[PDB]
Design a protein around this ligand. Sequence first.
Ligand code: A1A2S
Length: 291
Amino acid sequence: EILEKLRSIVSVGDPKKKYTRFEKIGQGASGTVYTAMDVATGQEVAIKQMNLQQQPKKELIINEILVMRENKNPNIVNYLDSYLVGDELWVVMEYLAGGSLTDVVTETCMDEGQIAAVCRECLQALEFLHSNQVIHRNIKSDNILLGMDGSVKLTDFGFCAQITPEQSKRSEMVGTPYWMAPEVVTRKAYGPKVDIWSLGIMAIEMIEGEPPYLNENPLRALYLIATNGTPELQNPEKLSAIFRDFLNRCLEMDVEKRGSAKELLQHQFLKIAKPLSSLTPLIAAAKEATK
Ligand SMILES: N[C@H]1CC[C@@H](CNc2nccc(Nc3ncc(C4CC4)s3)n2)C[C@@H]1c1cccc(Cl)c1
């Protein structure tokens, strides 16, 4: 009954009177997401509402709130507060007007400059987390949020892990199959570089619209990751050499040879990044496409 630890972390007081103008903007396995407005303050917020029954290990909920409140950063969606509403947990975060990267990758064609701009900002989030001994473990386009200024922010700490010098590696088979690094899929001990792999897969989303093997069922994709290793692009000839190089460094099978987030921030690919204002036309296109 670590529900007591969860009960001591959360704020008390009715969120249903602190916040108004509730609108469902999202579903998800982890719960439903609503927008709302702080009754007093006017601030727009996103609230994730999670059924405590839905989650069998309430230990992960605790971990999610702590990591988020302890690791604030400009490239991470800001945690504001949390509340228990009966058997439902509400997490309140800053609302980022814009959209999901998923909408952009499925509905637009991104140029290398735009892709490099997104990758740089995500690598900055990862550098910060990994330096704070946190592995995200669920990097994908669905967890990247884009601001109306082209701000890029990472969210979702539902699956993350804290490591320590004593225990530098994890062994849970956690993530979303198509984005999971081979060492994770094959139950080897793994470290922060699983996030770099997932980032590589997200770069393939930005190129091709989908992670490798998405037409296949999840179990089949796990088999394909275990057997193929480094995925191949549909049309690699369409990419610059330096982009292909960046991809190769993100998607190295040899963990020790795979780029760290720090190493990758100095890659040549990132030097072609467009300014973040370059992403706002993608956001406009995606909103129009998903009317
Ligand atoms: N699957 C994802 C789809 C995209 C986004 C919802 N859609 C949307 N659309 C337009 C603006 C906007 N802005 C937001 N600012 C702050 C937000 C915090 C994350 C809540 S969201 N979100 C989030 C959602 C998500 C993230 C993490 C866990 C789960 Cl379970 C679900």
